[PDB]
């Protein structure tokens, strides 16, 4: 049911429900992308994938992994059109923290700053909701690794392990019993949890090429994407 302009605007329904925002919740679901964010003891591993319909697809540009800072990366979901616009913004707001405040941002406030203007995108319907979804990571002093996620409803969010998106609902359900455990996680254990959670969602387990797996650990604090050489090495390690 709808009355007035509430179809085209974000005002709340007589039941206290938003319209243009509730349609953007599944706008990420139409993107067809599953990014699960899980954090171990000293490390956090992000697992993603991509589709290659045509043989002309370039791995470089179509790669969904985006690195905001040397020590802070991210990943997106849903429509990739709006996601790139938020990527360069996170680079700009992190640089303001570098310029003004002089040091690296904890990224906990970066989620707040991005979601604050993401709330402005949710404020006026003339500037479009910008239905791109953002998932963040980073390193804070004596906090170990961190994991953060922001959808385009405009709040800052992060926890131990949090995943939301198209198929991420089936991933978090299996990981509740899987992640606990809840003890010190080796690098091979975190990668094993990336395929096993994907095996419950998908169970295709195709070539490690198409899937993109990042990691954030404290040895060198800089964020690094896993090389295709080591991904196939850990893939044959968990499956004997």
């Amino acid at each position: 049911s709808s009355a007035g302009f509430d179809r085209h605007i974000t005002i709340f329904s007589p039941e206290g429900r938003l319209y243009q925002v509730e349609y953007a919740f599944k706008a990420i679901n139409q993107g067809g992308l599953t990014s699960v964010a899980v954090r171990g003891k000293d490390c956090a591993v992000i697992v993603t994938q991509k589709k290659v319909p045509d043989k002309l697809l370039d791995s470089s540009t179509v790669t969904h992994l985006f690195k905001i800072t040397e020590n802070i990366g991210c990943v997106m979901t849903g429509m990739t059109a709006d996601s790139r616009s938020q990527v360069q913004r996170a680079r700009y707001e992190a640089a303001n923290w570098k310029y003004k405040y002089g040091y690296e941002i904890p990224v906990d406030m970066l989620c707040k700053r991005i979601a604050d203007i993401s709330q402005v995108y949710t404020q006026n319907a003339e500037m479009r909701p910008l239905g791109c979804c953002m998932i963040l990571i980073g390193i804070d002093e004596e906090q170990g690794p961190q994991v953060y996620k922001c959808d385009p409803a405009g709040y800052y969010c992060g926890f131990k392990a949090t995943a939301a998106g198209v198929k991420q609902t089936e991933s978090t359900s299996f990981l509740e019993k899987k992640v606990k455990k809840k003890f010190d996680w080796t690098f091979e254990q975190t990668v094993e949890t990336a395929i096993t959670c994907l095996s419950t969602v998908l169970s295709i387990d195709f070539k490690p090429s198409e899937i993109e797996v990042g990691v954030v650990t404290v040895e060198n604090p800089k964020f690094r994407i896993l090389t295709e050489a080591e991904i196939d090495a850990h893939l044959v390690a968990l499956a004997e």
């Binding site: 605007i9 005002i11 429900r17 604050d116 949710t122 392990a161 978090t172 509740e176 992640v179």
Partner: protein, 232 residues
């Protein structure tokens, strides 16, 4: 009619105003936060429950004190809370350094809620469904105030919104009368707070803020459960 259009606010044929009235219906569907004005201090007990066990409450904080002597809690929806937080963080600190002194919280509720009035009352495109429970300590006598999206500031010794707003307000209307003992007022305020609350109560299921006359102190789930349930 209609007839009032917008800017700053919408229209009603009979009373109040339609449109944002529907956002007011979402205010009752927000997170319930109890509050207590007891003796020389103000106590604020909120309710926070995560969707799944994969979440840790140590990250997201529902209590974000603007000043050392003034805390706050929110009754309502999401980041529109955090929007007025940074606002009041800018708003209250400007007036703090204008005269260089905090000045009693009565003028703080005057100025800080003045722009919050305009911000909530004036057209924001989409409405704002976040209300607040205002607290502080002024000249030895603290204050507990309750704002709303409509911009009507109240004064309560014990108040509740969100859930129990129908039950808890009538509860505190009967059992609580005038001013009573400090910790004894917290007792009956939590008894009605657990009325509609879930049967499972843990350190992470709620949070209790307290405004001392010596300045605000934000508690943690550790000391929240170690106090009492039943905190008194």
């Amino acid at each position: 009619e209609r007839g009032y259009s917008f800017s700053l606010t919408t229209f009603s044929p009979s009373g109040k105003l339609v449109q944002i009235e529907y956002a007011l219906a979402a205010v009752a569907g927000g997170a319930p936060s109890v509050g207590i004005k007891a003796a020389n201090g103000v106590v604020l007990a909120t309710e926070k429950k995560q969707k799944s066990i994969l979440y840790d409450e140590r990250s997201v904080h529902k209590v974000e004190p603007i000043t050392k002597h003034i805390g706050l809690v929110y009754s309502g929806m999401g980041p529109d809370y955090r929007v007025l937080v940074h606002r009041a963080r800018k708003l209250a600190q400007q007036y703090y350094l204008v005269y260089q002194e905090p000045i009693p919280t009565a003028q703080l509720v005057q100025r800080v809620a003045s722009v919050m009035q305009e911000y909530t009352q004036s057209g924001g495109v989409r409405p704002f469904g976040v209300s607040l429970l205002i607290c502080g300590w002024n000249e030895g006598r603290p204050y507990l105030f309750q704002s709303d999206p409509s911009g009507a500031y109240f004064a309560w010794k014990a108040t509740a919104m969100g859930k129990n707003y129908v039950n808890g307000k009538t509860f505190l209307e009967k059992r609580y009368n005038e001013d009573l003992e400090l910790e004894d007022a917290i007792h009956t305020a939590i008894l009605t707070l657990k009325e509609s609350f879930e049967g499972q109560m843990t350190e992470d299921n709620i949070e209790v803020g307290i405004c001392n006359e010596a300045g605000f102190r934000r508690l943690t789930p550790t000391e929240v459960k170690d106090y009492l349930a039943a905190i008194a």
